[PDB]
């Protein structure tokens, strides 16, 4: 299923006037001007429930918006009202943007569903203490879970069969940018011979919970 991904139609804005006194953080800086647009598809259950949300930004300001549940453009700040009024008086263009929840959002999800949705990468679990010699206080037990996808994961520490729910220090879910995540869920504890600390990892690429004792 190697079909062609569709892009959203970028509408052309019109001239006319200016607005009085704009903002500008300043503090001495190079002048810059940015026209930026995010056409978002929000899937609540695949293509069953979908909502298109277009977001316009001029520099640091979000100024216009298109919520498919409205069906028209709506200014967020006054900088975007001219576009709202212009685009909204254009019937064809509206029927067109409205159609994009189907011609773009749904159409593309069916494509990505073949590979991005079902993507799974199993994690690598690794435990290990932290701090040289005695911590002169509680020591750190590190549960490293790296190289996984999707992000949904549960990593639980236990102490002698009991789940430790306090004393946890974590980086939280860390995104590497290459479609893999990682995370270190540490545990402030002083080691004690026959005593045991266990890390349990649950993730959709697994069939059964990964446990690692130390």
């Amino acid at each position: 299923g190697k079909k062609v991904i569709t892009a959203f139609n970028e509408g052309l804005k019109g001239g006319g006037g200016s607005l009085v006194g704009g903002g500008s953080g300043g503090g001495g800086s190079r002048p810059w001007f940015l026209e930026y647009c995010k056409s978002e598809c929000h899937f609540y259950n695949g293509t069953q429930r979908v909502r298109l949300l277009v977001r316009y930004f001029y520099n640091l300001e979000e100024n216009l918006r298109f919520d498919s549940d409205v069906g028209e453009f709506r200014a967020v700040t006054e900088l975007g009202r001219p576009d709202a009024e212009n685009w909204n008086s254009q019937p064809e263009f509206l029927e067109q943007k409205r159609a994009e929840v189907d011609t773009v959002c749904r159409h593309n999800y069916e494509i990505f569903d073949n590979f991005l949705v079902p993507r799974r990468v199993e994690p690598t679990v690794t435990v290990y203490p932290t701090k040289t010699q005695p911590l002169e206080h509680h020591n750190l037990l590190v549960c490293s879970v790296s190289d996984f996808y999707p992000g949904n994961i549960e990593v639980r520490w236990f102490r002698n069969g009991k789940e430790e729910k306090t004393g946890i220090v974590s980086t939280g879910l860390v995104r590497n940018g290459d479609w893999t995540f990682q995370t270190l869920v540490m545990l402030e504890t002083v080691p004690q011979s026959g005593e045991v600390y266990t890390c349990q990892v649950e993730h959709p690429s697994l069939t059964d919970p990964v446990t690692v004792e130390w």
Partner: protein, 182 residues
């Protein structure tokens, strides 16, 4: 079942630099971006190329529109600029660091605008131009951007690494350090 996902088409045109960008995002990760100058689709992961295609000319067409609209916007705002938001920088490794086993240093640049930075990896105080790669400007939920720079390295207790980032919103470049600790 319940499949919750978000696919985002992010595009921008920037001045005075005259830089443009068109990319697609899936759950926070880039699927692909179009090389505007070479007019070609660049998949984030090569394996992706075989399941779908995308006409790069459509990205260019869109950028042409962003270009036009920017002038309209500068007119409407009477060419009023704004502040340059400086980025946060975090240097981390991709996997647990074991001596002698090749690893990858990640330089995460976050929360900045406009979308332009100068980045330089330093290994033992000197720039590294081999075994480095980088992403385009990635969107965030808000109005700012994040970017990733990568460095292939071989863990050894004799080296110290640095990620030097420069941005118009910074007084002087921000240099984040990294070194192996057993």
């Amino acid at each position: 079942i319940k499949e919750e996902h978000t696919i985002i088409q992010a595009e921008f045109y920037l001045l005075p630099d005259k830089r443009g960008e068109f990319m697609f995002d899936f759950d926070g990760d880039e699927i692909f971006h179009v090389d505007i100058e070479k007019s070609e689709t660049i998949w984030r992961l090569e394996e992706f190329a075989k399941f779908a295609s995308f006409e790069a000319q459509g990205a260019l067409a869109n950028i042409a529109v962003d270009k036009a609209n920017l002038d309209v916007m500068k007119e409407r705002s009477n060419n009023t600029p704004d502040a340059n938001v400086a980025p946060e920088v975090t240097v981390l490794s991709r996997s647990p660091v074991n001596l002698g086993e090749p690893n990858i240093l990640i330089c995460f640049i976050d929360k900045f605008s406009p979308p332009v930075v100068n980045v330089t990896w330093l290994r033992n105080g000197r720039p590294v131009t081999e075994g480095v790669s980088e992403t385009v400007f990635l969107p965030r939920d808000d109005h700012l951007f994040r970017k990733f720079h990568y460095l292939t390295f071989l863990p050894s207790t004799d080296d110290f690494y640095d990620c030097e980032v420069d941005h118009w919103g910074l007084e002087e470049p921000l240099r984040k350090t990294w070194e192996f600790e057993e």
